[PDB]
Amino acid sequence: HMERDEVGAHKNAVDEEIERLSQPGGSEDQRLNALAERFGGVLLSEIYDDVSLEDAPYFSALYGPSRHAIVVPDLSQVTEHLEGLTDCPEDLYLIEGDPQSFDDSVFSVDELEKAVVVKIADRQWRYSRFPEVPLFGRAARESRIESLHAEREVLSERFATL
Amino acid sequence: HMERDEVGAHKNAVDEEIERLSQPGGSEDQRLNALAERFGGVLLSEIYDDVSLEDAPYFSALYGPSRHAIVVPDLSQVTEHLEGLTDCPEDLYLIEGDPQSFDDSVFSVDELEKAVVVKIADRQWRYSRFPEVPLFGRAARESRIESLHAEREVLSERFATL
């Protein structure tokens, strides 16, 4: 029985992670996508598609609100699109870089218990706790979820077979 | 008839501003209030209670996300309150200063068509359009509304007497 039950035990653990990974959140303003396209840029959330499940929470918190940044080649030519822009979030972030070879912003940071503390300026801190559902690593989360699902099923059948 | 009608016209004008000023928004995370109290600080929101109707839009946008900041006496002394803090927004801002004689943050900014563009860092821009309902100036906005309402009523009564 110890074998059969170890399988069921492993199947429950897998389900638990699946449940964890499938919670809603790590959402983005619906308008950011079109905006990125209309600016000729790529969302930072899409660039950090593959951030590991291990790093996603820390990095999403680290970036602060700039996590929703649209990355484009040159800011100078974005101006064109900003002048008169109103149909966008009250705070829109634009970062200059290469979507294909992007360099992480550098932050003055200290870590805490599943949280981060960024020094924005002198006598100005930003406390960003780790999100349950990080904005980054969405692609990696999805693959993981599907893989875990496939394993869950193999174990469910093995278990039923006794 | 020209007198009576100018009264009506001025009345409608007042009504229209009341309408504008009364739209909901300039909202703030409901949890921020208790935390400000728990950290022994005061929300920037409250400190900038009386920002003129003229300056509120521009000023609210300028601050970016830091607009929801909790101002406290000494940052290093809040640390203890942040350790393990999870029931708060994913990004919590804390500014060290004196609520009664608070000094503004210094921003590197350029203005646009009712919007601001703050340089967060090299190759990093924040575009913040003016809010219809700014976070700051709530108190001044409230007084304006009441006064305008009181004026509205006098004009309605004058009108009815023709």
Swiss-Prot record, chains A, B:
Q: Where is this region: Flexible hinge?
A: 24-141
Q: Which domain of life is it from?
A: Bacteria
Q: Where in the cell is it found?
A: Cytoplasm, Nucleoid
Q: Where is this region: Sufficient for ParC binding?
A: 3-162
Q: How does it assemble?
A: Homodimerization via its hinge domain. Binds to DNA via its C-terminal region. Interacts, and probably forms a ternary complex, with MukE and MukF via its C-terminal region. The complex formation is stimulated by calcium or magnesium. Interacts with tubulin-related protein FtsZ. Identified in a complex with SpoT; IscS and ACP. Interacts with the ParC subunit of topoisomerase IV.
Domain topic, free-text comment: The hinge domain, which separates the large intramolecular coiled coil regions, allows the homodimerization, forming a V-shaped homodimer. The N- and C-terminus together form the head domain.
The entry's family comment says: Belongs to the SMC family. MukB subfamily.
- Please describe what this protein does: Plays a central role in chromosome condensation, segregation and cell cycle progression. Functions as a homodimer, which is essential for chromosome partition. Involved in negative DNA supercoiling in vivo, and by this means organizes and compacts chromosomes. May achieve or facilitate chromosome segregation by condensation of DNA from both sides of a centrally located replisome during cell division. Stimulates both DNA relaxation and to a lesser extent decatenation activity of topoisomerase IV.
Name of the protein: Chromosome partition protein MukB
Gene (name only): mukB
